[PDB]
A paper describes a structure:
Here, we present the structural and functional elucidation of [name], a hypothetical protein from the genome of a thermophilic Candidate Phyla Radiation organism, identified through metagenomic sequencing. The function of [name] as a cysteine protease was predicted through remote structural similarity to the Homo sapiens vasohibins and subsequently confirmed experimentally with fluorescence-based activity assays.
The [name] protein, including an N-terminal His6-tag, crystallized in two space groups with different crystal morphologies but similar resolution limits. It should be noted that these crystals were grown using protein expressed without the addition of Zn to media. The crystals diffracted to a maximum resolution of 2.60 Å in P3221, with two protein chains generating the functional dimer showing two-fold rotational noncrystallographic symmetry and two Zn2+ ions in the asymmetric unit. Interface and assembly analysis of the form 1 [name] dimer with PISA showed an interface area of 1669.1 Å2 (15%) and a binding energy of −26.2 kcal mol−1. However, the absence of other metal cations in the zinc-free crystal structures implies this is not a promiscuous site, and the tetrahedral ligand arrangement is strongly preferable for Zn2+ binding over other transition metal cations or the sodium and potassium present in the buffers used.
Author numbering:
A (entry chain A): -8 to 41, 44 to 215
B (entry chain B): 0 to 40, 44 to 215
The structure:
Amino acid sequence: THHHHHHGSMHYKAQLQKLLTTEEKKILARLSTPQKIQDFLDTIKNKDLAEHTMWSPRAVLKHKHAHCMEGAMLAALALAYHGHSPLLMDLQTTDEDEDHVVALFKIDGHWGAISKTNHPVLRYRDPIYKSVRELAMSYFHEYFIWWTKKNGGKKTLRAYSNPFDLTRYKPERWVIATGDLDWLAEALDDSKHFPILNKKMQKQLRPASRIETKAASLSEWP
Amino acid sequence: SMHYKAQLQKLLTTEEKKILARLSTPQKIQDFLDTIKNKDLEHTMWSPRAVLKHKHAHCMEGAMLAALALAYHGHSPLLMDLQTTDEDEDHVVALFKIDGHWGAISKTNHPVLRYRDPIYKSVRELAMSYFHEYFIWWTKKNGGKKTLRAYSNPFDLTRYKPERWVIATGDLDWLAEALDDSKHFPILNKKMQKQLRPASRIETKAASLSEWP
Ligand SMILES: [Zn+2]
Ligand SMILES: [Zn+2]
């Protein structure tokens, strides 16, 4: 079976079709499973700033380059195109680290996540997680400072957002935007988050090992 | 707990007790296991005594020592089995709790299936934190296949006379077998298994890195 009953929106899909070129739609039509979407993001070059800005799905399809939220927004678009809600989840760190965004999806009542990253951490999640919490917690141990010895190995994840439904915005605002979508990032950051720790628990945390920081440092793209 | 500790003290040498006395937090225990050389197996199943003597351990050997150290400071000596398909080997950790939250001490040579901080609200939640990083990384044949299938209830070693495992000179294969036979909870059904996606090449490369050469 492949169908489009994932509680997205026929009306919403119609609005998307009005905005997209034939080429864009032909691509999105092929990306009919979460797995196919992740496979597609694997062929996109991970970004650098070798401007460096928060591109729309349109820009990403044109230039075949993406950082995490650019990847997740394209994924959410592709999920919506096949009848899922376009859902983002923010993973919120201390100010020592950058947040990471994934695109949530469900298959047979279980949560998965599509993720664009250059490192072997914060990757795709299979639809096997019984709750958003359970999925989010599967990231905690592998979210740490690996790029400097300053707080080397410190675990930096502090909270996860409720699923963030992009349906609330006019699709023009993000799908095909030419501006900076920093307002969208900001709206995500400002949405309901659930803390993972209290102060006591934070004091318990143990740094990741040297082998872990070395492993995390590996790069998919030069 | 106090009674159990007393029984352990009867069995242990002064040197062994001096070591266990130092390992007074789960974090200190993990730090200690980090100084023990990881194995690379003919196969063994050494007691905590043997492990302290030879300073060498595979995963269950590490977890049994951890459980001992936890018990010496009044925690239950709990193991959790992580059970894979036939394509992979199981992994064992020592569970612990601090302020109502589960953590895990783990002995491994690779940057996966590591220590877990006491932040997980249930055994299930902790176990699920291992799923994505349990995969075939050593061959191209089913490269990246995710192999974890079930986790055990906490396995309390209190059910056995401590003589039987703490200081045993025999093979503790019976203990491994008892663990493997205890209540397990499946993570997938057949439908979910069909959804699984292989880990990426970058992930298998990362998993292949070694702490001990
Ligand atoms: Zn479709
Ligand atoms: Zn954020």
